[PDB]
Amino acid sequence: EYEIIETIGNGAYGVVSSARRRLTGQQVAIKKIPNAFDVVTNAKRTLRELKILKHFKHDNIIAIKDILRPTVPYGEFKSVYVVLDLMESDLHQIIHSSQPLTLEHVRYFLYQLLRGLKYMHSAQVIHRDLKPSNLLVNENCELKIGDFGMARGLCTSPAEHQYFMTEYVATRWYRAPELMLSLHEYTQAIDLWSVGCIFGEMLARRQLFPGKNYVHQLQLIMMVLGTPSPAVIQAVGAERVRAYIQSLPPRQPVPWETVYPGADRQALSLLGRMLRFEPSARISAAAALRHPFLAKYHDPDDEPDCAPPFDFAFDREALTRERIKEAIVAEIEDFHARRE
Ligand SMILES: Cn1cc(NC(=O)c2cc(C(=O)c3c(Cl)ccc(Cl)c3F)c[nH]2)cn1
């Protein structure tokens, strides 16, 4: 049914290969999740991502094109094969390379990212791990958000460690203040912090806050944003961090013009609207698409919401590996039923 071209990916998620459907000739990416059901944690993530990707139909979100059916007896179905959009590169590789990236690239890439988040956010899904390398880009310059392993809804299970240990959620360099400090306000605004970090990175083609560890991360952020306000300092979850921040002299925010000298005025306008300490002070995805910097591409008339919202209830459930296997197989059957 498929003709393998070459291998490209490894690992943590599995193995990725480029391929073509024999009948159509159309090119795809095939991900093998080997021994998919052997570990509960992994199996749970697999089910969560299968449901998420099947839920979205959006040009700026990686899509499942096919899932191969077991052609073996059920008991020997060990590894899962997912067929996905083939994407040549990603935003990290592009930013950190000798490829072009003018203001127009920045503008268009940001536009698509935000377009994808408006959709995803409206379904009540926080990605929680946006970074350049999770944003794939194909030969046509389409940007697609992938890697939904970290994604959660607005109210989650206290049985997960992450519920309390927010400072370990996602990736340090793009991790929102509210996660670092446990500000007890966990919304889609988490993503808009990461977007700001990505935006900044694209403007200078280097990482905005590359802290070596926890404390240095906070220091790097505060070098630009200044010290958090009193109101935020009070809201800090743990005593020692709270105390640490209070131990520093007040610092005034640096205007973005200084951080990124000579950069587009309209770009820094929007950037500033995203990188603020307080979650609810940050611009939303939907509103950022309205900002003058994205004038050129914004079309209210082609930036859909996602109905209905995604429900994360299934993830809360306590299932054995063998039940998770069934649930995943049901999703493969459902995929094909819904088509054929
Ligand atoms: C450099 N290069 C990468 C490819 N592969 C693709 O086309 C491709 C990747 C995806 C993903 O959902 C995805 C995966 Cl599988 C692993 C990790 C992350 Cl972060 C992802 F986003 C979908 N298609 C080919 N070359």
Author numbering: 54 to 393
From the article:
Extracellular signal-regulated kinase 5 (ERK5) is a member of the mitogen-activated protein kinase (MAPK) family, which includes ERK1/2, JNK1/2/3, and p38. Activation of the nonclassical MEK5–ERK5 MAPK pathway is associated with increased cellular proliferation, migration, survival, and angiogenesis. In approximately 50% of hepatocellular carcinomas (HCCs), the MAPK7 gene encoding for ERK5 is amplified. Phosphorylated ERK5 associates with, phosphorylates, and activates a number of downstream transcription factors, such as the myocyte enhancer factor (MEF) family, c-Myc, RSK, c-Fos, c-Jun, and Sap1a,8 which are involved in the modulation of apoptosis. Selective ERK5 kinase inhibitors will therefore be useful in elucidating the role of this signaling protein in cancer and determining whether they represent potential therapeutics.
Smaller, nonbasic analogue 34b provided the best balance of potency and in vitro ADME properties and had good oral bioavailability in mouse. However, N-methylpyrazole 34b had good permeability and low efflux and was also stable in mouse liver microsomes. The structure of 34b bound to ERK5 was solved to a resolution of 2.75 Å, confirming that the binding mode was maintained, with the pyrrole carboxamide forming a bidentate interaction with the hinge region of the ATP-binding site. The methylpyrrole amide lies in a small channel at the mouth of the binding pocket, lying between the side chain of E146 and the backbone of M140 and the lipophilic side chain on I61. The halogenated phenyl ring adopts a conformation orthogonal to the plane of the pyrrole ketone. Pyrazole amide 34b had low clearance and an oral bioavailability of 42% in the mouse. No inhibition or the closely related kinases ERK1 and ERK2 and JNKs 1, 2, and 3 were observed in a kinase panel screen, and 34b had an IC50 > 20 μM against BRD4, in contrast to some of the earlier reported ERK5 inhibitors. Thus, 34b represents a structurally distinct ERK5 inhibitor chemotype, which is a useful addition to the toolkit for interrogating ERK5 signaling. When examining a truncated ERK5 construct that lacked both the NLS and TAD (ERK5 ΔTAD), 34b inhibited its kinase activity in cells with an IC50 of 77 ± 4 nM (mean ± SEM, n = 5). However, a greater than 13-fold reduction in activity was observed (i.e., IC50 > 1 μM) when 34b was examined against full-length ERK5, suggesting that this compound also induces a paradoxical activation of ERK5 transcriptional activity.
